[PDB]
Amino acid sequence: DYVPDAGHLVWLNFTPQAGHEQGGRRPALVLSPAAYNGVTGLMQACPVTSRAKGYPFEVTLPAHLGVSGVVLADHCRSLDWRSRRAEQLAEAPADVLAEVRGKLGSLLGMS
Amino acid sequence: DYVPDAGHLVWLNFTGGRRPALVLSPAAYNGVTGLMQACPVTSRAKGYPFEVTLPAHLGVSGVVLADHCRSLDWRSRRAEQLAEAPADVLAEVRGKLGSLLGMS
């Protein structure tokens, strides 16, 4: 009954093609609304990486949120959250969301 | 030495298999990162609210799926320019994708 909504941080699965690579899961910041997500089974989401290097599209998460690491605003991508067995983990302050959207909007050449 | 630029329609490998896509990110970012933000083009098109129709005789036919935009490594996928989108298609795709991602 869980449907991801804008601002949710979700666990998402990934499985390499080659059965010999490991595959695992990774948290992602959801950008698209529940209306779209719940219906289509897809979402626009940015990955969270534990390797913060000071890359200018990295957006930091608050230290007590219970998700460590950094959102890569420019790595936004359409993912199927049902097949990837999305699990809610936390809710990103609309703070973090607004910074991700401004950086990504700039890259996409938004009006 | 091709670098994809905003508005370009490109071929991208399945990596046997090439598919068309509309680039949204500019060449200065694309060249430096080896990544780009692009929406896939399909011939499989009618009604869907995030589809943007490509005008006839552009060199590829069908729609842009604005909601299926993604970061991808274009260098690995051997990007080759297919055409250039009219400024109206590019603005329409950015409008729908902007709405979906919750921008203003």
């Binding site: 499985t15 097949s83 | 430096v32 990162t33």
Partner: peptide
């Protein structure tokens, strides 16, 4: 945000490779 501003601070050391989401899943187009 100004893209030239963000471009200025990218370096070979801070560059991230394409995020590995493995194979296509479910309804993903690509």
């Amino acid at each position: 945000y100004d893209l030239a501003a963000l471009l200025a601070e990218m370096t070979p050391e801070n560059l991230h490779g394409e995020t590995d989401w493995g194979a296509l899943e479910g309804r993903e187009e690509w």
